[PDB]
């Protein structure tokens, strides 16, 4: 349908606007490339594994892997919806949000492809909390806002896509990355890839939280839609999180030649601290 | 709707696609930041014109502001719509072709600041073959494709923003630039734009052949579709060009002044020359 105007041609971009403020900080802070991370001695390292040991580091690459597909996909009907309702400051940043994820997906792959598993289908440790969030979930309430973007419809797009995916499990992901390899001292070019990867990641979240708490300032009683939305998902986080809990403790080889620690009950409490923690980062008020 | 599980879980990108070559040089070519462009030359540049000086070169910002925030919004149908088909690495190379839409967008209303023209509404440089095209063909043709993703659809969508759009009428507006202010030594800042934005647009130009000619490879009648589509456009193409010329020819001051001989003639016969070129750049066979 017909454009009846042109904004810039109008007037100019609203310089002030919070999402043109952060779409110049996307572009200042994301000129990394993929491409330049030097994976030789994740290969060296990931062959000098045990079969183990090997597959102790998979399930959490199937989770980022995917996630990061799921997400490059499933941002294109926020962009159009916002588009539809003129929000060109907001299109602006989410060109950004979509080339991040894009390198995302890239960054997973080349590792995958670098230390040798390329060829393996890592479809087995998604299980089925897993899918119901990023098989079913995500990409329903996300194409959702093709027909309906009520505010409503985009609340519930950004709590699961920003709040729970990204501000949830995401976040976690990176946390338990670190508190693993980073101390065996394994994978130095997937962890420069995880470094990157959560510093694009609090721009992602504070799109979400700006796009919630603007629909929030309208009628304070989308603040209940918001926490309810959260709770709904909950139970699916907690069951990919005990799933995978569940593989870790089964198969302890690589903790023990790493003399690491890794303590579940932690992971576990901060996957927790981190869902509360995105609740308060909206205000009723 | 569901996804149905994802390639880099499954296997990984396709590390020898067209499109996944175009991405990685996009990266590697599209650092450039609108931001870091010294505009004060232009603004004294400006200030230092006569009113009649002045109204010459809106025209031309004007047909690039609107079509750049154009482009912007419209090419989410085609990201999705390959999305769909699950063409990744489309998808992937898709990222950079919108964020640099975006930086274009952000680089014209710059200029437009900088200048002191943003509180001008410059919609009155754009006749009713310029409508045609902007307000109506192009989003007609990109939005089609949420509802109708058929190789007719998806060849008249390339054929419309990247062979018409961009090949044919931006090409020839970033030659009509230099021509003109790159002679008289105006405008610097503006130029160092352009060349970015000529820059990007040989890959975006490039998307749009090779998925032109991969459709026109499975089916050489969709060849005559894609000629069928060029032509019916080139009367507003014409129209458009025809008015500028007729707008340029009427204020003569700023190239008295500066003693630049406007060939109209040689200006035409580049927007000829654009469209038979791109004609050309598709095989039958
Ligand atoms: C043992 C503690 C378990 C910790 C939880 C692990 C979470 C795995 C993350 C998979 C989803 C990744 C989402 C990416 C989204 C984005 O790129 O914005
Ligand atoms: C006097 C000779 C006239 C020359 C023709 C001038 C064309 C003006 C261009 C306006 C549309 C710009 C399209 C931008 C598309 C993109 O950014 O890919
Ligand atoms: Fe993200
Ligand atoms: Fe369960
Ligand atoms: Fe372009
Ligand atoms: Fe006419
Ligand atoms: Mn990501
Ligand atoms: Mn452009």
Redesign the interface.
């Known amino acids: 349908?017909?454009?009846?105007?042109?904004?810039?041609?109008?007037?100019?971009?609203d310089?002030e606007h919070p999402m043109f403020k952060l779409?110049?900080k996307a572009?200042?802070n994301g000129?990394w490339?993929p491409?330049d991370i030097d994976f030789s001695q994740d290969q060296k390292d990931f062959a000098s594994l045990t079969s183990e040991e090997k597959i102790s580091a998979l399930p959490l690459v199937?989770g980022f892997?995917?996630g990061?597909?799921?997400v490059?996909?499933d941002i294109?009907?926020m962009?159009?919806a916002l588009?539809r309702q003129g929000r060109?400051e907001d299109?602006?940043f989410l060109?950004?949000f979509?080339?991040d994820?894009?390198?995302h997906?890239?960054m997973?792959?080349?590792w995958?492809?670098a230390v040798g598993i390329?060829?393996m289908?890592?479809?087995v440790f998604?299980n089925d909390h897993y899918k119901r969030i990023?098989?079913?979930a995500l990409?329903?309430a996300m194409?959702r806002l093709?027909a309906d973007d009520s505010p409503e419809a985009v609340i519930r797009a950004a709590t699961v896509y920003n709040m729970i995916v990204e501000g949830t499990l995401a976040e976690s992901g990176y946390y338990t990355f670190r508190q693993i390899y980073k101390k065996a001292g394994l994978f130095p070019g997937l962890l420069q890839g995880i470094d990157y990867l959560n510093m694009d990641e609090g721009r992602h979240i504070q799109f979400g939280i700006y796009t919630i708490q603007r629909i929030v300032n309208e009628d304070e009683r989308y603040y209940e839609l918001f926490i309810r939305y959260m709770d709904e998902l909950w139970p699916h986080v907690i069951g990919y999180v005990d799933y995978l809990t569940e593989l870790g403790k089964r198969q302890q080889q690589l903790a023990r030649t790493y003399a690491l620690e890794i303590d579940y009950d932690l992971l576990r409490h901060y996957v927790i601290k981190q869902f509360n923690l995105r609740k308060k980062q909206i205000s009723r008020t």
């Not at 105007?5 to 100019?12: L, N, P, S």
């Open positions: 349908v017909h454009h009846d105007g042109f904004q810039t041609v109008k007037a100019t971009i310089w779409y110049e572009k200042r000129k490339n491409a199937a892997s995917a990061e597909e799921a490059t996909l294109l009907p962009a159009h588009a060109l299109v602006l060109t950004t979509m080339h994820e894009a390198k997906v890239e997973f792959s080349r995958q492809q390329g060829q289908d890592l479809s998604h990023f098989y079913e990409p329903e194409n093709y």
